[PDB]
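Subject: uracil DNA glycosylase

B.,
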Amino acid sequence: LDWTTFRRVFLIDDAWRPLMEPELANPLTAHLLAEYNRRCQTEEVLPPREDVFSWTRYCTPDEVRVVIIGQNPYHHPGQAHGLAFSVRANVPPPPSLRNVLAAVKNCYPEARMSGHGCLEKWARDGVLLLNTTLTVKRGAAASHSRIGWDRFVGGVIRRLAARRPGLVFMLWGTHAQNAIRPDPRVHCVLKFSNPSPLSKVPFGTCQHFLVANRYLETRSISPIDWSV
Ligand SMILES: OC[C@H]1O[C@@](CO)(O[C@H]2O[C@H](CO)[C@@H](O)[C@H](O)[C@H]2O)[C@@H](O)[C@@H]1O
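Prediction pasted inline below.
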């Protein structure tokens, strides 16, 4: 597994090399990539290839201030673009994203919200929106959850966390909470129910956005402007 080749294939930004290159030495990464490629040859896999690692482009590893974990990408064309929860700018926010934006609006009654659900602005500001499974077969939710992305992604998050003391993690729902278990004494770990529409627990009362900024300030880190 060669870094230059891998980087070129997925248009990965090079600032992430120290965090991702080590993952290429894990024998299981080769298996993951061969299976991902096998899937792309036999299915309409989403998001498009050039977007699978869009999260490496919006900000560098040292700019990450908050990590929000997702599960699987949207499986309808035109929705997913490589970031957890986010959808392309011309797509009315699906239920889970609508729920997240509503909590944001409840936390910040004055925020000037655009009404769209493209979280590129958050990503550029260092809010890492990462799915534990990066791809999916069109029309079949979570269809790629067993191909190996979760270990690769978890590895990257682990290296990022060791490199960076003081991160805020927002772990929403069971799956997110089981996949990433950051040292609570080194990082601010915030848990909540799932913004997924299947949850019968309202996501609207989530105050993580406010809690996160108070934490960042105690660590002399600039707060996040959550408007979007
Ligand atoms: O439902 C109206 C409106 O309420 C919001 C804001 O809290 O979310 C609630 O309702 C959803 C179902 O429509 C739930 O899935 C969600 O958990 C709950 O907080 C908005 O998201 C929604 O537009």
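Residues 98-99, 102, 197, 199, 202-204 surround ligand 1 (CB under 6 Å).

T.
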